[PDB]
Amino acid sequence: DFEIEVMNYSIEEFREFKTTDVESVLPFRDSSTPTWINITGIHRTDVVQRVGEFFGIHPLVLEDILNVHQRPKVEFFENYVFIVLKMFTYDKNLHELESEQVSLILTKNCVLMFQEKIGDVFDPVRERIRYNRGIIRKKRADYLLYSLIDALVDDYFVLLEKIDDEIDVLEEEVLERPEKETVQRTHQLKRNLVELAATIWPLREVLSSLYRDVPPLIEKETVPYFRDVYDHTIQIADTVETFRDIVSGLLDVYLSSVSNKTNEVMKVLTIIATIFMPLTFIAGIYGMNFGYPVVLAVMGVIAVIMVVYFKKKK
Amino acid sequence: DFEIEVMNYSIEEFREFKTTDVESVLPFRDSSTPTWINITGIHRTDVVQRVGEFFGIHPLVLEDILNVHQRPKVEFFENYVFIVLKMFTYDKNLHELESEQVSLILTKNCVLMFQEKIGDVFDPVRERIRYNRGIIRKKRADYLLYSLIDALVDDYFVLLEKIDDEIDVLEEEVLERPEKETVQRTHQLKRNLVELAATIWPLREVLSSLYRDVPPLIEKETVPYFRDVYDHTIQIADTVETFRDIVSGLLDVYLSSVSNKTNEVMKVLTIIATIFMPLTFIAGIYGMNFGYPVVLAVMGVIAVIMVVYFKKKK
Amino acid sequence: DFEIEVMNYSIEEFREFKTTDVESVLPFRDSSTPTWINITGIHRTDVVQRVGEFFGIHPLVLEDILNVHQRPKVEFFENYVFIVLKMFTYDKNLHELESEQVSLILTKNCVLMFQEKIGDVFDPVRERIRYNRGIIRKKRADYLLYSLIDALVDDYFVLLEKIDDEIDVLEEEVLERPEKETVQRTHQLKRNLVELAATIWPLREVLSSLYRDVPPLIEKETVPYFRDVYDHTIQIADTVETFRDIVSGLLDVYLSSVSNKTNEVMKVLTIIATIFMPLTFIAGIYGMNFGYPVVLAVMGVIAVIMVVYFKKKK
Amino acid sequence: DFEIEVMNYSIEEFREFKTTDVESVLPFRDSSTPTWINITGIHRTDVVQRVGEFFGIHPLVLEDILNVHQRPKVEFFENYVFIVLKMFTYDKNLHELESEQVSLILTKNCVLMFQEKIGDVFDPVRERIRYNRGIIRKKRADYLLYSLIDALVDDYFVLLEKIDDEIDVLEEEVLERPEKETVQRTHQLKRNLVELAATIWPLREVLSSLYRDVPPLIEKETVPYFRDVYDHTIQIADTVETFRDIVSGLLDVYLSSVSNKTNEVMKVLTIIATIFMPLTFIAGIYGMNFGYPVVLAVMGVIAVIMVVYFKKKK
Amino acid sequence: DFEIEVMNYSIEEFREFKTTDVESVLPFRDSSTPTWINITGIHRTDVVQRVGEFFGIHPLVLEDILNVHQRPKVEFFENYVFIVLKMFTYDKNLHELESEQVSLILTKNCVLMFQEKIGDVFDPVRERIRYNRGIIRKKRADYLLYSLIDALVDDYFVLLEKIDDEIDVLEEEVLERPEKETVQRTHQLKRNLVELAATIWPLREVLSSLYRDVPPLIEKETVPYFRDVYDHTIQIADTVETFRDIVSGLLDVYLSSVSNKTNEVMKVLTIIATIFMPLTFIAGIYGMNFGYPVVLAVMGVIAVIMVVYFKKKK
Ligand SMILES: [Mg+2]
Ligand SMILES: [Mg+2]
Ligand SMILES: [Mg+2]
Ligand SMILES: [Mg+2]
Ligand SMILES: [Mg+2]
Ligand SMILES: [Mg+2]
Ligand SMILES: [Mg+2]
Ligand SMILES: [Mg+2]
Ligand SMILES: [Mg+2]
Ligand SMILES: [Mg+2]
Ligand SMILES: [Mg+2]
Ligand SMILES: [Mg+2]
Ligand SMILES: [Mg+2]
Ligand SMILES: [Mg+2]
């Protein structure tokens, strides 16, 4: 896929368009009114290059934009702030989660964006812009980021939800469903949970590090805003920790459950054994080729003497 | 529910009413005598919105009062100090804990509050101002906050008291009651203890950060008072950690109990089968179609060669 | 119980008595020769109240002396240093430890103590004053504290010694005595260790904080003395963490020992069954109602094709 | 093996050769153009001895170059910098990893290297120089180090990829392949990870030390280059953790898949027993020597009373 | 035992002798040429007392050298530097490790030592002095210290080596030797590892603390030396952890290997049981007392309908 979307807006108005030409966005560098140049489809490296070059982005900072397998970070430069993030997509049921990586380059009045596939969680932001809702138009571009970012971080809540409600189910399946591939299901969660954890802890650190310093900040306007996002990014990485703490000691339940049922089966076998082994032994004697109720009575009394004795076991 | 209580008190005198009108409590802003404007029922967004606009509160902070799914935190501002706390209910028997979110805003001589349902642990703190008991009237309106806060933390101790006695019992249940749902009951405790853990450790931080700084403090009057509640907050978060440390290694005690019971049955089975196998074999042989006490003697001896050989196993 | 002992002493002299009157001790506030006012029995809150009120002790601080369920701490004030400490009693056999809380208040030339029950580990110290042994009399009253403390921390060694020698035994019980109430006897330990380890880790911190600061110290006379009690305090809390780590991987030994014994039983069943199923089957067909050493030969022969085959398994 | 290979180059041009002679490289100490003196074969302690003494290197450092069983480290000196590193080789299938130590000495315009065997992951670096690709020729000799180092670190990624893929398979081996030597295949991995873990966490520290300090650096040319390696270095020593954390809880699946299967076996064995045990006993009673379908029906009716009762277990 | 040894040496010469007299060593105090007054046999408390007093040592400091049950530490004083350490003796095979305590006091030109039994790991040090090997004579008496310590620390490598190889074996013993007291052999390993890990971590800090400060150091002569001991000291403390991480999750393996084998046994027992229970039932029916190849055919066919059905289990 490949599609470039821009949303230049001022305090008063805006336009939007989805051109697939490269050059038709460059002039916006000098635009003194907040623009949002979203470059969906990063597979075309020729485009990032040209843009990179124009805006005065470093060559390595570009490369990072291209290399998806990277830990989220926040780089501070002389001209532009560069952040990378990774939003997720849990395939509910098909227990497995997938990870697109989005890169953000803030410069003057331009929030430059780089997605690798169409679709995101930024719909809410563009439209609040679209039909002027909330305080987005009123404020500058450095805010705009701290809107996109708010948007991304929000998404993780959804997942958590999904996961809580996953846990809730995959808890029940140990307690009272000792079956086969519950086990495998469990281990798919921890896996999922670890994988996640080390993408929030570093993302947490981004909004952590984006808080301490900040050059184009508009101090008491954009800052105390994203404190309330940094705050989110905490809870996220707090919650996770909770999950990875309950999930951790779950398999153990399963085992207790199972090694407890094994007790039951074993027990019945033993009890059946213990009465008809001897009773079939007596009657074995009396197939020897070398009072009929006398033997049955004694048998039938022994088969009691047992079932009694088995009231310390039941 | 919705019921707005107010306790304006000076060094000599106080009143107390229950009006459901939003307006009839605003003029206490400039009342220079310690007020306590309790707002029960945070479902009514319109009333917080009004009182928040009037007291000068930030918009994002109000949002947080309304959003119950948030960690405990304390926010220091130019005019007011904002605090977010959680108080718990443990339903004994039905092993499960429930959580309501109290928020507090101290501004001049107004300890402004926000509960989401009727009923709370602040009964004694309002009663101690009622029949003038202790030093609550005598001291200012920022002290009032550190009377409520003490009440909320003092409740937590009750929860620990319920849980200790719980564990007490639910431990016996592993040692001397190896049954079925003991398993799940225990996992319900860890669950509950993690859930807790993540709600004191932050609350503990509240009273820890509420220590280091503080602008309306009255240094050596109210600060060395809550040092005593920040202390309480520690102990809590230490006790919780003791529990989650004893509860942790409990399933392994059950497992053991049961992977030992397995053995017993497993054992008895084998002695039975081990003896009445061959005896039911010898007495099998002698059902062939192709000294009676010779065979019985030789049977009745082997079954003793076995019993004695089985004094390495008993 | 109630019994207030005192021991004032100078470089030259001392007395000792066991009055049970409250005021007969108050005049020792201004005594410029080291005085040790022991208040055994904290149940008489009135007694505490008076003394406290007299010596100028803060109200909350008095509460702490009466409230036994607290983490050991060292409070620094303008006039007096206030410590809270706990000392234990391990009932050998009945595997269960008990806790009494000692509170200490150092002021000018008064070390003001608070025990709840008669009988302590302070018997050597008063004796060392009694029969002027060592450098006690010689030195001041702040040193006196660091002679009680030492004695408190030195008892803990006794405990560790007990528990070492308790572990040792309860370790053998796993390896070479895989029985029943080993399991519970073990959990009792981790229980007792956690309990403990959350009482030293804090007590450590007291001597750690009593090191970094200190107003009545006599720098190079008392400070480098209790370095070598803060030293001990580290060791104890180092030793405890040793125990809580060995013990930690203990139950897991048991399970393996049992899950291995099960194997033996399981295995012996199978050899038995695996021969005397078919030999009773053979001998089962030859009871059919529709060369005697020919069948005994082929029976006896398979009964070795078996035992031979079972020389991969033994 | 033994084969010393050098690469002196300037902004304009370069040469390469592979002399076995020790002396034909020493004159490059004063070659003002960047020289790369690769010494493959550190077994010849004489060759090392010589080149060391000439370059004014300390003795102890040399030893380290000859000692392979050492943690990677960086040692800063007045004249030169010294680094020790280790690269790895994973034998797929034969689950085991082998470790050659590489050591580096930067001085003026001399990157001095020490391989213990022929073959390395530096093929590209020499190649990029060879066909003047990228910015290698252009920049100084201190930059050259931070090209070797990169290629080495980059190697590690390949390992991680190998293992990820390994994990992915050996994970399926517990889920859906509960066999025998998966057990040992698992541990091995833990074994191999730790071994790794503890060679990255220090190698990570090297590039962490190499970043804070640095005397020959060319500040804003080389220093911000290797940050992006330092970076890598983080990611790796992060990812490792991921793995180590997943694998950790893996054997607990297997165990669970096992204790579950035994249960099936245990069950089958029980129900065959629980029905034919009695039926044969009846048909035992009627082999006594002291309406035919009467018995068969009562048998066959019983055999149904079982199978139905055993619809609670299937 | 008891045998005081001394080795005063200078840039040029030395003597050695093994007096049993306490005084014959005192005069060295003032010797301006490095002396090493090794006092083996600390059971004679009278000796230590005397010399302690003569050198000007503190009384508590002496006690420490007389109390062997103590953590390694580095006390810095006005005149002297005091250090305590421990050296070990792993009884190979008799899986258990023994711990003697060495005590060191550096003062001017007097490295004063305190062993409790004959034999140690300082042999190499004394002789490098004996037959002027290396830079031991050349340098001062401080340096002497950082030669002994080098020697002691160098012993730990032996231990590790002895343990690394112990693990290698006591690992196999799980995979491929599921016997009995292998179990206990691995708990003895953990046991031993923790015992160890609690005396390096502190021995590590001592060379950490000996690094940060140091008064008689000879800055760029003896300091940079022991940097390469502290170094060693870290690796030691590093590898130990590696071990106490492999050995940790080993018992697990053994569990999985035996809960696997319990599966086979269980299995076999089952198949044998699941054919000859009904076949012996058939032939049970035909021992009733109320086409010979007809029954044999139908029995035999079943006994293949089975064997085929059990191609899902093998
Ligand atoms: Mg990059
Ligand atoms: Mg939001
Ligand atoms: Mg939930
Ligand atoms: Mg918020
Ligand atoms: Mg209270
Ligand atoms: Mg088991
Ligand atoms: Mg208190
Ligand atoms: Mg002592
Ligand atoms: Mg000491
Ligand atoms: Mg376990
Ligand atoms: Mg070295
Ligand atoms: Mg690269
Ligand atoms: Mg018959
Ligand atoms: Mg050496």
UniProtKB/Swiss-Prot annotation, chains A, B, C, D, E:
Membrane-spanning parts: 268-288, 291-310
Impact after mutating residue 274 to M: No effect on Co(2+) uptake
Outcome after substituting residue 287 to F: No effect on pentamerization. Abolishes ion transport
Activity regulation comment: Inhibited by cobalt hexaammine.
Topology feature Cytoplasmic, residues: 1-267, 311-314
InterPro entries: CorA_cytoplasmic_dom, CorA_TM1_TM2, Mg/Co-transport_prot_CorA, MgTranspt_CorA/ZnTranspt_ZntB
Membrane-topology annotation of the record: Multi-pass membrane protein
Outcome following mutation: residue 228 to K: Increases protein stability. Decreases ion transport
Effect of residue 289 to A: Abolishes pentamerization. Abolishes ion transport
Site positions for Threonine that confers selectivity for Co(2+) transport: 270
Record keywords: Cell inner membrane, Cell membrane, Cobalt, Coiled coil, Ion transport, Magnesium, Membrane, Metal-binding, Transmembrane, Transmembrane helix, Transport
Any GO BP: magnesium ion transmembrane transport
Effect of residue 287 to A: No effect on pentamerization. Abolishes ion transport
Coiled coil, from the record: 153-200
Residues the UniProt record annotates as site (Essential for ion permeation): 263
GO cellular component term of the entry, any: plasma membrane
Domain of life: Bacteria
Known catalytic reactions: Mg(2+)(in) = Mg(2+)(out); Co(2+)(in) = Co(2+)(out)
Effect after changing residue 286 to A: Abolishes pentamerization. Abolishes ion transport
One GO molecular-function entry: cobalt ion binding
Family statement drawn from the similarity comment of this UniProt entry: Belongs to the CorA metal ion transporter (MIT) (TC 1.A.35) family.
Record's function text: Mediates influx of magnesium ions. Mediates Co(2+) uptake. Has high selectivity for Co(2+). Alternates between open and closed states. Activated by low cytoplasmic Mg(2+) levels. Inactive when cytoplasmic Mg(2+) levels are high.
NCBIfam families named among the record's database cross-references: corA
Designated name of the protein: Cobalt/magnesium transport protein CorA
Gene behind this protein: corA
